[PDB]
Scaffold this motif. Structure first.
Motif, mmCIF file in Angstrom:
data_model
loop_
_atom_site.group_PDB
_atom_site.id
_atom_site.type_symbol
_atom_site.label_atom_id
_atom_site.label_comp_id
_atom_site.label_asym_id
_atom_site.label_seq_id
_atom_site.Cartn_x
_atom_site.Cartn_y
_atom_site.Cartn_z
ATOM 1 N N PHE A 82 0.825 -1.185 0.000
ATOM 2 C CA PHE A 82 0.000 0.000 0.000
ATOM 3 C C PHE A 82 0.877 1.259 0.000
ATOM 4 O O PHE A 82 0.619 2.189 -0.766
ATOM 5 N N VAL A 83 1.803 1.327 0.942
ATOM 6 C CA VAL A 83 2.568 2.547 1.097
ATOM 7 C C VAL A 83 3.493 2.779 -0.109
ATOM 8 O O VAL A 83 3.649 3.954 -0.525
ATOM 9 N N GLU A 84 4.080 1.725 -0.662
ATOM 10 C CA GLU A 84 4.928 1.936 -1.859
ATOM 11 C C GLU A 84 4.095 2.410 -2.977
ATOM 12 O O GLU A 84 4.502 3.310 -3.748
ATOM 13 N N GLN A 85 2.881 1.889 -3.177
ATOM 14 C CA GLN A 85 2.020 2.372 -4.261
ATOM 15 C C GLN A 85 1.576 3.796 -3.992
ATOM 16 O O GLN A 85 1.468 4.584 -4.942
ATOM 17 N N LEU A 86 1.284 4.143 -2.745
ATOM 18 C CA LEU A 86 0.902 5.502 -2.421
ATOM 19 C C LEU A 86 2.032 6.501 -2.739
ATOM 20 O O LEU A 86 1.827 7.582 -3.276
ATOM 21 N N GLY A 114 14.344 2.445 9.308
ATOM 22 C CA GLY A 114 13.312 2.282 8.303
ATOM 23 C C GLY A 114 13.684 2.932 6.990
ATOM 24 O O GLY A 114 14.843 3.326 6.754
ATOM 25 N N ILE A 115 12.698 2.923 6.117
ATOM 26 C CA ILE A 115 12.747 3.695 4.898
ATOM 27 C C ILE A 115 11.600 4.713 5.024
ATOM 28 O O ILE A 115 10.494 4.296 5.454
ATOM 29 N N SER A 116 11.840 5.981 4.690
ATOM 30 C CA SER A 116 10.771 6.990 4.960
ATOM 31 C C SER A 116 10.786 7.998 3.890
ATOM 32 O O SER A 116 11.776 8.161 3.129
ATOM 33 N N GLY A 117 9.743 8.778 3.831
ATOM 34 C CA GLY A 117 9.623 9.889 2.912
ATOM 35 C C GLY A 117 8.761 10.998 3.400
ATOM 36 O O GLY A 117 8.074 10.801 4.458
ATOM 37 N N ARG A 118 8.790 12.124 2.734
ATOM 38 C CA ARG A 118 7.996 13.220 3.063
ATOM 39 C C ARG A 118 7.579 13.905 1.810
ATOM 40 O O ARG A 118 8.409 14.140 0.937
ATOM 41 N N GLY A 119 6.310 14.258 1.682
ATOM 42 C CA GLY A 119 5.900 15.023 0.463
ATOM 43 C C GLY A 119 4.430 15.464 0.614
ATOM 44 O O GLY A 119 3.773 15.231 1.585
ATOM 45 N N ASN A 120 3.993 16.117 -0.437
ATOM 46 C CA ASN A 120 2.646 16.634 -0.440
ATOM 47 C C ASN A 120 1.646 15.622 -1.001
ATOM 48 O O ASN A 120 1.837 15.038 -2.033
ATOM 49 N N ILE A 121 0.604 15.414 -0.223
ATOM 50 C CA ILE A 121 -0.599 14.720 -0.688
ATOM 51 C C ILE A 121 -1.742 15.662 -0.625
ATOM 52 O O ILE A 121 -2.182 16.036 0.453
ATOM 53 N N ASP A 178 4.377 6.106 -4.909
ATOM 54 C CA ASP A 178 4.499 6.327 -6.366
ATOM 55 C C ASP A 178 3.367 7.211 -6.874
ATOM 56 O O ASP A 178 3.578 8.057 -7.791
ATOM 57 N N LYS A 179 2.165 7.063 -6.361
ATOM 58 C CA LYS A 179 1.069 7.868 -6.872
ATOM 59 C C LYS A 179 1.333 9.339 -6.701
ATOM 60 O O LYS A 179 1.080 10.138 -7.600
ATOM 61 N N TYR A 180 1.856 9.715 -5.529
ATOM 62 C CA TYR A 180 2.061 11.100 -5.147
ATOM 63 C C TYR A 180 3.475 11.590 -5.362
ATOM 64 O O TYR A 180 3.798 12.756 -5.058
ATOM 65 N N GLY A 181 4.384 10.771 -5.849
ATOM 66 C CA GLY A 181 5.754 11.240 -6.076
ATOM 67 C C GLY A 181 6.493 11.495 -4.804
ATOM 68 O O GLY A 181 7.327 12.422 -4.745
ATOM 69 N N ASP A 226 1.225 18.175 4.014
ATOM 70 C CA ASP A 226 2.581 17.630 4.218
ATOM 71 C C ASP A 226 2.452 16.353 5.005
ATOM 72 O O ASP A 226 2.004 16.280 6.149
ATOM 73 N N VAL A 227 2.844 15.276 4.373
ATOM 74 C CA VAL A 227 2.639 13.892 4.912
ATOM 75 C C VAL A 227 3.994 13.127 4.910
ATOM 76 O O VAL A 227 4.764 13.229 3.935
ATOM 77 N N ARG A 228 4.214 12.343 5.950
ATOM 78 C CA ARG A 228 5.354 11.475 6.049
ATOM 79 C C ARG A 228 4.923 10.020 5.919
ATOM 80 O O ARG A 228 3.880 9.624 6.420
ATOM 81 N N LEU A 229 5.720 9.254 5.209
ATOM 82 C CA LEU A 229 5.582 7.837 4.965
ATOM 83 C C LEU A 229 6.681 7.061 5.676
ATOM 84 O O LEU A 229 7.807 7.493 5.596
#
Length: 196
Positions: free
Chosen positions: A31-35, A51-58, A37-40, A62-65
């Motif tokens: 789910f999270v990997e597809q999310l 972990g592996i993490s990210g931050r970006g706009n949804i 990719d959807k949002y870049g 401003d959301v963190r993965l």
């Protein structure tokens, strides 16, 4: 930090390594990997938080993965320090995970409750409490309690995989509601999913 029940941390549970990537217990990673990719959103190495993490706009938020790289039964060793460091309350956290108590192709959004036997959730609830939101991605239950390891660490047959992939795809389309704090509506529209 987080703000109300606008979701701003989305965690996917799973195990690291190619040998686990296709197994049912990695549903949350899917789910999270597809999310991402959807949002870049870049999912990058986060050794500080294991972990592996990210931050970006949804959708203007401003959301963190986060994908813990701890192994499933140690997932709190990633989720808890990460959420504390960023001042993210449980009420703003969504944790996606495999759910043995639901069929492949059933997905539900739940707020609160226990771990339901899930060994990743079991490592998280003692620390932050139960009041985070969960994307319960049905994976089915095996024959017995003996069989649970073999089922969650198995690669689902194609029909079940298709059912899960459809349900995941539906949920991706509802994340906009979640990051906007529309938990009730998201709950209604996620839980109403049917595969056919």
């Amino acid at each position: 930090g987080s703000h109300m029940s606008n979701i701003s941390l989305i965690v996917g549970l799973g195990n690291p390594g190619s040998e686990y990537a296709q197994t049912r217990h990695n549903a949350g990673f899917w789910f999270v990997e597809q999310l991402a990719d959807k949002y870049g959103i870049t999912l990058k190495n986060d050794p500080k938080f294991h972990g592996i993490s990210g931050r970006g706009n949804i959708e203007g938020h401003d959301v963190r993965l986060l994908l813990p790289m701890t192994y499933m039964n140690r997932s709190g060793q990633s989720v808890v320090p990460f959420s504390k460091f960023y001042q993210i309350a449980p009420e703003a956290i969504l944790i996606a995970h495999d759910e043995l108590d639901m069929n492949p192709g059933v997905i539900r959004l739940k707020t609160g409750g226990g771990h339901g036997g899930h060994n990743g959730l079991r490592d998280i609830v003692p620390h932050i409490g139960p009041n985070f939101h969960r994307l319960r991605i049905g994976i089915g239950h095996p024959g017995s309690k003996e069989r649970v390891s073999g089922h969650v660490l198995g690669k689902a047959p194609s029909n079940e995989q298709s059912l899960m992939d459809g349900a995941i795809d539906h949920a991706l389309s509802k994340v906009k509601l979640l990051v906007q704090g529309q938990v009730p509506q998201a709950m209604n529209q996620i839980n109403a999913y049917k595969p056919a």
